[PDB]
Amino acid sequence: VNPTVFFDIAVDGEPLGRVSFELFADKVPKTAENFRALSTGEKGFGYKGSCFHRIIPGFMCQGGDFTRHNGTGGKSIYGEKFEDENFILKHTGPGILSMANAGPNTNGSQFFICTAKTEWLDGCHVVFGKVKEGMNIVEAMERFGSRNGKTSKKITIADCGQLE
């Protein structure tokens, strides 16, 4: 089966609740493996204790910068950066999990959770999963964001792992 991973989300260290994701290993196995390993922390680094640095209500929650905590950072399990695997999967609606980047072939650890259909990103950002449970937790998170993306409180991944 495709893997399932979870984040436990906290607001300034208070439990908010659990989000679980399906990873589309069947269509983007390299990109799915990256996010799975960073979620388990089996390699000794990954998402745990990292923040959603950029949240824009009605757009997306951006996270996964566990090096520099501000959108300049993050690293893949394959080195700093890796290639765009394909653009088969599209930004079809709320719950879509897609890679943030800084142009072609600059995939790291940074990702976003769509709270809308973001079709203008189709072909620019590799889609690799979707929210399975806790879309209400993502909707709560999205209320701590602003038009520029600054969060009014610290939104953290207190825990994460694989359920598969």
| Token pair listed for 35 | 């996010």
- For domain 4-162, the question of CATH label 3.40.50.300 is answered with no
Record the resolution, in angstroms: 1.9
Tell me, yes or no, if 121 is annotated catalytic: yes
Active-site choice (18, 45, 121, 162): 121
Tell me how far apart the alpha carbons of residues 75 and 90 are, in angstroms, rounded to a whole number: 24
Method underlying the structure: X-ray
Is 110 in the active site?
no
**91-111 burial string, b = 16+ CB within 10 Å, else e?**
beebbbbbbbbeeeeebbbbb
Cα–Cα distance for residue pair 102/147, rounded to 1 Å: 21
Whole-angstrom distance, CA of residue 47 vs CA of residue 116? 23
Q: Cβ-count burial of 72 within 10 angstroms (0-12 exposed, 13-18 middle, 19+ buried)?
A: exposed
User: Would you put residue 72 in left (φ > 0), alpha (ψ -120 to 50) or beta?
Assistant: alpha
Domain ranges of the chain: 4-162
